[PDB]
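Now read this:
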Amino acid sequence: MNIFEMLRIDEGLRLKIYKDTEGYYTIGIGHLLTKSPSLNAAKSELDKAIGRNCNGVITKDEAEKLFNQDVDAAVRGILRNAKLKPVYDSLDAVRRCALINMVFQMGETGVAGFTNSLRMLQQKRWDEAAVNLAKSRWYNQTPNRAKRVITTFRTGTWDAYKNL
């Protein structure tokens, strides 16, 4: 497993515009288009993103391309965020993927927000952070995925993804 394989599992692949867990227009491997309720806004965003007339459909190549940009963006966002950098730099290679996973899913600001959980990760207090992390909207809304990610932070292994 690597970060690509992990996000691939959490997000699945769709070549047609679809609605998020939160009902937002997305495509590919979890590539949010817009939070606006109009399919029209979404298609406009899709065309902009791809640089062609898509009419709500992309190719797999194009999906993977958005995915390459989004993983790259998540890493760089981390490394630039004053709050996320130190945590990332303190973690081992498996757990770094867990952090990325959250930033990909809820954004930089989303994650910078888990003050207590990040303090716990930095301190390598793994059980404690897993409990703290479960005390969130994230976990109540997407439990299956959150368990997989929390499990990764707790164990530093890929066992949560092996099953899948």
The domain at 1-164 is CATH 1.10.530.40 (Lysozyme).
